[PDB]
């Protein structure tokens, strides 16, 4: 239809929450481990277990990081979102 | 107190369930269902799809297990592609 769809508004919400956290420290277009952690603990508090150990955020970032800069760009973050959403769906069958 | 990010994720599941459920396999998107999703729900981001050839190309790209249809995991890859492309034009 002509209204922004639920789908289109979801996509927009993804962009906004990323820039909401990536903009805090250092590079505003990437999530340092610092920023990724805060995102997970505050916004995925129903899907993912809270992160409080440093060993954990290390491991998460390693898997998300494909270009090897130690940070998460938007493409990598979308991959993360894809992964998590797939899991919640899987826990609805 | 569910978050914007989580609500957004749930809507992805919901929009998939809506279109996959119309025809055929109620858990997968066939070409026609995929095309309607793009024309009905992604009309402000993607150019309308009018040709079958294009539907074909899109499904071939998305279909990683070779069954001619698109499951949820294959759809999420689609949402990432698209969302990433838009992020780059904003």
């Amino acid at each position: 239809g002509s209204h922004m769809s639920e789908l289109e508004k979801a996509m927009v919400a993804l962009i906004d929450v990323f820039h909401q956290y990536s903009g805090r420290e250092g590079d505003k277009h990437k999530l340092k481990k610092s920023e990724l952690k805060e995102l997970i603990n505050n916004e995925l508090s129903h899907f993912l277990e809270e992160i409080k150990e440093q060993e954990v955020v290390d491991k998460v970032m390693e898997t998300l990081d494909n270009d090897g800069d130690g940070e998460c760009d938007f493409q990598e973050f979308m991959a993360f979102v894809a992964m998590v959403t797939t899991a919640c769906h899987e826990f609805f069958e | 107190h569910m978050s914007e990010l989580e609500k957004a994720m749930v809507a992805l599941i919901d929009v998939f369930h809506q279109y996959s459920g119309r025809e055929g396999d109620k858990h997968k998107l066939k070409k026609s269902e995929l095309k309607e999703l793009i024309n009905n729900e992604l009309s402000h981001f993607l150019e309308e799809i009018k040709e079958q050839e294009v539907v074909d190309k899109v499904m071939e790209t998305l279909d990683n297990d070779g069954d001619g249809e698109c499951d949820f995991q294959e759809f999420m890859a689609f949402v990432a592609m698209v969302t990433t492309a838009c992020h780059e034009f904003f």
Binding site: L48, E49, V56, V60, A87 | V54, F89
Partner: peptide
């Protein structure tokens, strides 16, 4: 109308720990 032509361990860990409801 800015549109494209349509041609363009730890996660199991944090999803397993999602345990609640006694």
């Amino acid at each position: 109308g800015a549109m494209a032509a349509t041609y363009s361990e730890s996660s199991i860990l944090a999803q397993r720990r999602v345990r609640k409801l006694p």
